Design an enzyme around this catalytic site. Sequence first.
Site, PDB file in Angstrom:
ATOM      1  N   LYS A   1       0.946  -1.091   0.158  1.00 50.68           N
ATOM      2  CA  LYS A   1       0.151  -0.105  -0.102  1.00 50.68           C
ATOM      3  C   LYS A   1       0.873   1.171   0.169  1.00 50.68           C
ATOM      4  O   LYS A   1       1.547   1.472   0.957  1.00 50.68           O
ATOM      5  CB  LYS A   1      -1.071  -0.254   1.314  1.00 50.68           C
TER       6      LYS A   1
ATOM      7  N   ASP B   1     -17.009   2.799  10.218  1.00 47.51           N
ATOM      8  CA  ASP B   1     -16.745   2.249   8.885  1.00 47.51           C
ATOM      9  C   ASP B   1     -17.740   0.799   8.667  1.00 47.51           C
ATOM     10  O   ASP B   1     -17.637   0.444   7.827  1.00 47.51           O
ATOM     11  CB  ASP B   1     -15.555   2.143   8.222  1.00 47.51           C
TER      12      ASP B   1
END
Lengths: 122, 117, 264, 64
Positions: free
Chosen positions: C119, C215
């Site tokens: 990432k 989330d």
Amino acid sequence: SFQHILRLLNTNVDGNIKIVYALTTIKGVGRRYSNLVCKKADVDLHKRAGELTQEELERIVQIMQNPTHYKIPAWFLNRQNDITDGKDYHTLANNVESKLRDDLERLKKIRAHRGIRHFWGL
Amino acid sequence: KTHSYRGVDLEKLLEMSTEDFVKLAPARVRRRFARGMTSKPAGFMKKLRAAKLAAPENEKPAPVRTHMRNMIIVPEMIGSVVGIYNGKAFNQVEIRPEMLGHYLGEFSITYTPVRHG
Amino acid sequence: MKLDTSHMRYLTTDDFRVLQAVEQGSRSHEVVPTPLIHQISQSGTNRAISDLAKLSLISKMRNVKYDGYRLTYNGIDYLALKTMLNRDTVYSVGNTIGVGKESDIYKVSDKNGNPRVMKIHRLGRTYLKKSNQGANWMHLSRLAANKEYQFMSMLYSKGFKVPEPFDNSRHIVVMELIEGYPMRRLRKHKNIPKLYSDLMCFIVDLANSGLIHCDFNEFNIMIKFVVIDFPQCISIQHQDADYYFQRDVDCIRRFFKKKLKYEP
Amino acid sequence: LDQEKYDRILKEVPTYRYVSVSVLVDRLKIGGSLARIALRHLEKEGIIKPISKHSKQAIYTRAT
RNA sequence: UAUGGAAGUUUGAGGACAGGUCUGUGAUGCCCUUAGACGUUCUGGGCCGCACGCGCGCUACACUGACGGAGCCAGCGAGUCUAACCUUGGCCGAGAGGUCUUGGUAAUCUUGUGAAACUCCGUCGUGCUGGGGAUAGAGCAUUGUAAUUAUUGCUCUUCAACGAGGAAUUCCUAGUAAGCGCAAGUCAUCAGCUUGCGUUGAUUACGUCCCUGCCCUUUGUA
């Protein structure tokens, strides 16, 4: 008098709704076909599925199995001019499923494109 | 049961070709192949007769390397063997009697599959 | 867009150290002329810069006199991937991306041939016309990687089943492939009852520190649960926390009704 | 009706000032299938006045 | 000078260069590669291929609605000569389409381009339902030498998810947004492409620097 969902030609043909839109649940027949046969059954279209006793059923199924003689001009059936014999069929609920199913096989045996697509494609 | 083309059997399977074989066939054959006035001898009719003539006594006829895919299978090539060039070499295909009503291009596959695995 | 996989390989020996040479001075001198690379021969440094200036790992200002440089967003990238390869990881990039909005999921090959996820952290992915060089793309995105990186490591150390961060250097965080499928795209599963019994209790897990996920709605976690996009969480000190409780839960009270047909 | 609701509803509901196509579905009766036909008949047979004439929204009266 | 004014926002809204031109020359120099390695040409295939991530769109989840009749309402256009475009009309066929003649090199003929949304009156009734027609098969057509790897058109059948869309973001201040179709360009066939054209026709501020991004002042020092 009132009858609801019925089991013939292996399909649970629904009750309590409009007459054309009950037959369409059967595989191989649809909106125009159940329209035109309900014209050719000499039965009104605003009638519901709660009606249609057994003789009125037998006229409909009696017509659909030999459609070229009850005035259908052979441009309205679904599977016309078969590659086996040349006749004009209108394939129905479970005739339609294995009829359309075996066509893959007759394009596999001859080694045609689409049969090999569905061969190595699966 | 033999190959009933559309209600057509063996002798008139073998000769109705190009005159009225195209008549009883579907929409891409009848008025469509009222055209099809191409170079059908090419190196096709001569190898078509000499190559099926090159099957003596229970034998594959001689494979014809050729440069066509678009031709519909004719009733004369029933029981032939034809190499069909698909962008690489002349990939040999036997013709069978049930193959009528299809394209020569539909048998020789041009692209290979994606082959994951 | 901003990132590039092309030129990583073609730099030479001194380059990585020469491209490093501007970095040590960067923290103090954020404008670096040519000889400031030397101390940290007469072939060495500019043939590196010829790379670095023409390969865009160092920006160039044109003047008759010796020119001051300041290291480029592109240049840290490989410097990172230099120490990345040097801890150990990242033998090669993978063919499955992995292109997200703010972060770059990269199938990447660790030593032993381990396909894993890289990432890259930098925001607003397109390089942007509106940025001041040296800080916003580097340094903002630089710190914030570790901000997240040590959360998951701290949050995985909790013991809840989640991804474990593998490596972080210079706005690049690498972790497990974590195969599974998100519920955002969920196709079929038979057994919800303990699935969601885990889920709604997975919440008090998320809440075991006095936190709330926020989330926890769809597009997060997969059938192993595999959960992602952590950063949004709210403290017990965080004032409005109680409103977000029914937000999270009920949105996943919402989902199941449509797709997989369950109710608490 | 389905067994009795022709004779039943035709006595039951001239209740409010206003009947319509979709108000008849509120009372958990037959849907807009045949209750719309029932609006044509009872519209015709004296009871509710047609102060509309037409489709989707049919403004009507009570039994007058 | 709110008033009157067609119009009181600029009425309104637009229209010398290290640019290209040695590949333009029918002006004007220097450096590079050469022959089984310079080309011409035929046929077939691909440019569509698919676990995928990213982005532009189209259509959907309907009852301000789907379908069947009926009303019939524009503008921008554009068309066949050394040849077959636009097509009326008259037949044939469900239809696609086909045939027989016509007018228009064009304010005239196509064509009043009798377009669509729309409107009225009916069925349908809240059900992945008749919304939706994904995908695939049969038959029939047209183009083009050739459509097989599905051109496109028609008829029937098969009826996928989608029950209103997370964090993120795009565009917009009035005949405009949005909805609706039409013409022209590419073009043997082929829009879901683009550029124009008209038809139905909103809400919401008329400001601010919260962000965003850009301009412009003052400040510190080699």
